[PDB]
Amino acid sequence: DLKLPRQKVELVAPPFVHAHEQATKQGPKIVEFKLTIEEKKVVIDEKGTTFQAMTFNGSMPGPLMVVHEGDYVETTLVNPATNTMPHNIDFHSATGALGGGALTLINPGEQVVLRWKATKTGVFVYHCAPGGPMIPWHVVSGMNGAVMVLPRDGLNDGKGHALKYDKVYYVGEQDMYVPRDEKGNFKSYDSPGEAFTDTEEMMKKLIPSHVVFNGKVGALTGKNALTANVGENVLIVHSQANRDSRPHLIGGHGDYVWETGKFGNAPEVGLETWFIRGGSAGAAMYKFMQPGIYAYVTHNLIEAADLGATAHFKVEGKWNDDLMTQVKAPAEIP
Amino acid sequence: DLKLPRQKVELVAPPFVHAHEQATKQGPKIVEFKLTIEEKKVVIDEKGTTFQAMTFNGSMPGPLMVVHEGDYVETTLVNPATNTMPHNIDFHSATGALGGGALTLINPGEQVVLRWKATKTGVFVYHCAPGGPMIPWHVVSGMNGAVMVLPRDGLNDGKGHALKYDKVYYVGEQDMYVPRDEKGNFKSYDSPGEAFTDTEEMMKKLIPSHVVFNGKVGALTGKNALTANVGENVLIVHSQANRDSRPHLIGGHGDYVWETGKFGNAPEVGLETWFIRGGSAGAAMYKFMQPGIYAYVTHNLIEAADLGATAHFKVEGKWNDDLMTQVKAPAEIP
Amino acid sequence: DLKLPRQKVELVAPPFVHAHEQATKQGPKIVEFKLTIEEKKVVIDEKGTTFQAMTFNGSMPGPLMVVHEGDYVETTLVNPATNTMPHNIDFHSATGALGGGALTLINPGEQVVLRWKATKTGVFVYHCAPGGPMIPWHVVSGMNGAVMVLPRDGLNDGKGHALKYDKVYYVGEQDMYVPRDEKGNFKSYDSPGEAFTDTEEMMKKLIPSHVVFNGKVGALTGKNALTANVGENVLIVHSQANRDSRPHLIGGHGDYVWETGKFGNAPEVGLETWFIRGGSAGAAMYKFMQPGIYAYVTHNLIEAADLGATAHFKVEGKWNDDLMTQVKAPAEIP
Ligand SMILES: OC[C@H]1O[C@@](CO)(O[C@H]2O[C@H](CO)[C@@H](O)[C@H](O)[C@H]2O)[C@@H](O)[C@@H]1O
Ligand SMILES: OC[C@H]1O[C@@](CO)(O[C@H]2O[C@H](CO)[C@@H](O)[C@H](O)[C@H]2O)[C@@H](O)[C@@H]1O
Ligand SMILES: OC[C@H]1O[C@@](CO)(O[C@H]2O[C@H](CO)[C@@H](O)[C@H](O)[C@H]2O)[C@@H](O)[C@@H]1O
Ligand SMILES: O=N[O-]
Ligand SMILES: O=N[O-]
Ligand SMILES: O=N[O-]
Ligand SMILES: [Cu+2]
Ligand SMILES: [Cu+2]
Ligand SMILES: [Cu+2]
Ligand SMILES: [Cu+2]
Ligand SMILES: [Cu+2]
Ligand SMILES: [Cu+2]
Structure with a gap:
């Protein structure tokens, strides 16, 4: 149904942020992202303590996704067979279906494609939320990141002036x-x-x-x-x-x-x-x-x-x- | 002294809210409420854990009271002889006497009638606060609820537009x-x-x-x-x-x-x-x-x-x- | 370099606040304060529990310092030889050098003089922050206070009206x-x-x-x-x-x-x-x-x-x- 231009984003690991426009002359697009879940044991401190992490794209946090108001965010969520648990994704920026969670539960070996319209501006959490007690566990194991939905005119101070970050x-x-x-x-x-x-x-x-x-x-x-x-x-x-x-x-x-x-x-x-x-x-x-x-x-x-x-x-x-x-x-x- | 019309409210158990107007053409009234304290052992989880609760009107939370700015809220607080402890009520919406607490301490077998003028709009906590270490104990035992004081013109978005809830x-x-x-x-x-x-x-x-x-x-x-x-x-x-x-x-x-x-x-x-x-x-x-x-x-x-x-x-x-x-x-x- | 009038303040122990103007006709000044660090064992409750406190000026909190926007705050921080630890000061109101901490580390027997320009209005924490795990320890031992930076026109309600406290x-x-x-x-x-x-x-x-x-x-x-x-x-x-x-x-x-x-x-x-x-x-x-x-x-x-x-x-x-x-x-x- 949705006849809009498609744009792929190459995500980058935090704390960095993939290249994007603040103010833009583009209209709505379908912005394509891929997140590949990785469960892995990692080191979390300088003493060598280890931790059973669960991640989007290999990082804690998951990478920052950046779009503009009125874009459609189309995410391919991939749960390779090398993982052990089911996983999903809930976007606090999105409307319906428990943020997407109820449409993205995937077993190891599966992938799913979810699209949501970016109707709310701001920065928002995304996280895994499989159900029940698994919800907190997956989140505190590392399965959370964020998305930024910018106004098409960029940021402002409320008081008509632009706020441009370097x-x-x-x-x-x-x-x-x-x-x-x-x-x-x-x-x-x-x-x-x-x-x-x-x-x-x-x-x-x-x-x-x-x-x-x-x-x-x-x-x-x-x-x-x-x-x-x-x-x-x-x-x-x-x-x-x-x-x-x-x-x-x-x-x-x-x-x-x-x-x-x-x-x-x-x-x-x-x-x-x-x-x-x-x-x-x-x-x-x-x-x-x-x-x-x-x-x-x-x-x-x-x-x-x-x-x-x-x-x-x-x-x-x-x-x-x-x-x-x-x-x-x-x-x-x- | 106070020659205003009286209106009784039939409180309803949470999460529901007694019937009320948002915007109103009524002027100030004395709005009458009754709260009857009940100490009772209750079940709090699906495993059957029990809990020594202390409640206003039998519920946790206590019921929501709804009035408009400039109303006078006249509460009959009743502590039946079937209870064991003294109790009182503190309204965060009210001005003076520790929110009313210093005027409403009642032993089992007693009741008291407090009136306060609703000069502050918003939603506010009310809770029991007998004195000293009993304050936290009564509150975390369940003795708290809330009151809503609406503008007479109903809610607005700050930006001249009305905000009406269904x-x-x-x-x-x-x-x-x-x-x-x-x-x-x-x-x-x-x-x-x-x-x-x-x-x-x-x-x-x-x-x-x-x-x-x-x-x-x-x-x-x-x-x-x-x-x-x-x-x-x-x-x-x-x-x-x-x-x-x-x-x-x-x-x-x-x-x-x-x-x-x-x-x-x-x-x-x-x-x-x-x-x-x-x-x-x-x-x-x-x-x-x-x-x-x-x-x-x-x-x-x-x-x-x-x-x-x-x-x-x-x-x-x-x-x-x-x-x-x-x-x-x-x-x-x- | 800085050719402005100097004004000394006599600090007073909390909860009181040294005398000051709200609105003022004065222009920027160099406002001089002295803080003398005292480590001392104190009683913290009515049962006689003791506590190893570390303080600015002998009190918890440290005293409130009050200046106006655009003043320069010149603090002589003194760490007498009767103390045991090094100490410093970080002003959340100040810009640069970890709030001043990186310019004020003093051993027992030393003093230092720091000046910062009050470019941000509000109330702000100041605290000691020697480095590493000593940071929390010194703060929770009592080494924190606050500074108030008032607009030269005094406080306002945002809605052109003045807000004057008694x-x-x-x-x-x-x-x-x-x-x-x-x-x-x-x-x-x-x-x-x-x-x-x-x-x-x-x-x-x-x-x-x-x-x-x-x-x-x-x-x-x-x-x-x-x-x-x-x-x-x-x-x-x-x-x-x-x-x-x-x-x-x-x-x-x-x-x-x-x-x-x-x-x-x-x-x-x-x-x-x-x-x-x-x-x-x-x-x-x-x-x-x-x-x-x-x-x-x-x-x-x-x-x-x-x-x-x-x-x-x-x-x-x-x-x-x-x-x-x-x-x-x-x-x-x-
Ligand atoms: O910064 C948001 C804040 O600013 C106001 C103006 O006080 O609106 C600005 O921002 C809006 C959202 O980007 C714009 O649509 C509007 O045109 C602009 O003036 C507030 O309304 C808003 O809360
Ligand atoms: O929403 C409250 C907020 O809106 C403003 C207008 O920006 O005032 C509106 O609300 C008042 C309280 O209901 C009304 O008296 C006023 O007439 C109306 O414009 C703000 O002043 C207020 O903070
Ligand atoms: O209270 C601060 C708040 O008020 C506004 C007016 O809505 O500005 C007032 O305060 C400023 C800071 O003191 C003054 O410079 C200004 O002249 C005065 O109107 C807001 O801009 C500000 O956020
Ligand atoms: O939005 N889920 O916790
Ligand atoms: O308002 N009493 O905690
Ligand atoms: O500002 N230092 O914690
Ligand atoms: Cu998961
Ligand atoms: Cu969530
Ligand atoms: Cu009680
Ligand atoms: Cu209270
Ligand atoms: Cu210190
Ligand atoms: Cu700090």
Whole structure:
């Protein structure tokens, strides 16, 4: 029935985002994406703790999909026979059938093709949701990502002015529940199925062992720090499919923030810390003013420093002594 | 002193809401309500776990009271001699005397009549609050509900347009703290008083055993699913008197959301997930576009699927293939 | 370089706030503050539990600093040799160098002078952040306060009208993690260093033993209740540097609330309960209408009544029977 142009997208792994237009002169298209599910044992911390992950496209989070209002998003979801469990996909951006979940349940060896019309603007979670107790389990095992539905005119500040980002990053935050043995050491398991009973018991107590960005402690640091230059406006999309978070850019601000993540609402301005409700994505833009290292955290600092939820930015440019200066370096008290 | 017309309301059990006008041509009235406290042992899950509940009018939540701005709400609170504890009522909608609590403490065998002027619009929690450590205990035992204070012109979108709902439901969410024995089984108690010491010990650790809507796992499912038709605008009032929640309609959206719950503020539009602060009520309206089953959850999915916090809607009407379609059903991967 | 007038401020202990102008005709100044760090063992509850606190200026929270937009805030941070640990300061109001943290690390015996330009309006957290796991530890040991950056025209309601407070209070909320021995009694330690291992173990489990205002259970009660008169507009700044909170004035409202705390955004109106994201300050103003006692709580009532997070207001003036009246005092049920 649907006679619109088709456009394929090559997804890229987080924190990066596939190339896209903000404002566009294109009309509605059918935008084609493929997600291939991978169950895999991964390392989640610098001590070598392992984790039975379940992923879209091999990553935690799943990749960010970007379209415009009124596009149709046509996703081929693939569950190779090398996996063990059924899986599906629920898009919080979509209308009907439990977000798509009720139309996309696939066993290992199967694939399905779902299309949904992007009638709601903003950033949105997508996640697996097979049914019943498997819903939380698949999500906290890593099976969640996000989609961004941009207005065709790009972003605005609510107050007729355009808001154009120079780059966008996607920070997916994951609460993880790794049980401990009697000794006190994290357990390892041979399969997701084998991990389930201990992992569910822990899940129901509502305290994660790890809270990470991009799948691992320290993922968005070192060589893989986020980057910017003084003068660049950076959009940071943050999602959390199961649990609240409170993002904060240490040494910066949220110049324009959509903490509930939906572009039909004006952004708030000049925030210190914002709030991502579990089950949502939000977005914050900041124009960097100072060079150096920044930390991007959830501002439960226990979670940030001790459980894994810290990213860095390395920013190049000229220091601004008007905005901040060390008037007197550390010295003995007179 | 107060020479206004009197109108009696027949309260109805949640999730339903007593009949009322949205926009009205009536002026201020004294609106009369009666709440009769019932302490009772109830079943809270499908395994037969019991719970020492304390209720207004026999239900968890207490019933939704609906009035208009500038009405006077005159409540007869009754504590029959068949109860064991003193009780009172605090309305977050009311001004003075700890919300009414300091004027309504009644022993078993007593009743009291409180009137308050509805000067604040929105949805608001009401709850018992006897004093000291009894405050949390009575609330988490079930002694909380909500009141809705509508503008006389009905609801609006902030942007001069009216927002009329076709039906309203009240979802009261309850965090419950049921201790376990050494075996690991939930305990049962012969009285609220007997439950108190174990229950307080658990409460202070801040992790509920159950998180339920309408008093029980599965209460708002099966025969008792919420209902709608495609085309109907449904208002969903959600309250949580003690603990945060993050509502989400799976397969839908919040078209217009007052997450802080107060009609003097414009609603936000197009939300995926919203946030009910513990100690508050909020409200979301959605116009259904697709038939079928929806789940209405808190989007801590552990809480939703594993601890009790899932409701269903069953929606009738015609499927819209433009909004969503299964392009290719599950098939073997080529 | 910077040729502006200098003004010294004499800080005062919370909940009070040093004298300041709301609207001002002054232009930018260099506003001088001194903070002297004190590590000390303190009592945190009415049972005599002790706690290894780390403070700015001897108090939990640290004192509220008040300036205007475009001022330069020049802080002399002093770490006397009588302390044991290095410390620094991070201002969420400031731009660059991890909020100042990367320019203010001082060993015992040292001081440093940092200046930052107040380019963002609102209330903001400041806290110590030495590095790594020490960050959460120093914060939850008490090393956090707030700064308020007022517009030069004072506050407004977003809707061209001025919002002038008659008084302001600063409520700093502190999550504390005091371990227990095998007996079940809270432990005491001889130094912060000695407390660290047990305290970190507890911290990572994310459940505080105490949640207090102004450093201690009951601090803002009795002789030290907050006060007001009927007719007075009171601004209540609330901060939480590590963990969410949900403030509520029992028997009142938030007439004008900036829950995210930033004056570039209009306030919300008529709230029952608001939300302070961990890592932030927010503010609420209320004009008292009724005399008597009010409780100001976080509306996790377990935290409020059982873990320490309750303040009182004692309000003088004439009772308003129009707003609320006890129509019939407690009596036997007919
Ligand atoms: O930023 C969204 C916010 O801005 C307003 C104007 O105050 O509308 C702008 O954004 C709409 C969505 O992109 C545009 O359709 C509109 O033309 C533009 O003025 C608000 O209505 C909206 O909530
Ligand atoms: O929806 C409330 C929001 O809308 C505004 C207009 O932007 O005011 C509308 O709602 C008021 C409350 O019902 C009415 O009194 C007013 O006449 C109407 O325009 C905002 O002022 C308000 O925050
Ligand atoms: O309260 C802030 C809110 O109000 C608006 C007007 O709707 O702007 C007022 O506040 C600004 C900041 O103080 C002033 O510069 C402006 O002149 C005044 O109208 C909004 O723009 C702002 O979000
Ligand atoms: O701003 N530092 O957590
Ligand atoms: O949208 N599903 O949790
Ligand atoms: O309003 N009382 O918690
Ligand atoms: Cu899955
Ligand atoms: Cu979901
Ligand atoms: Cu009671
Ligand atoms: Cu209350
Ligand atoms: Cu310190
Ligand atoms: Cu910080």
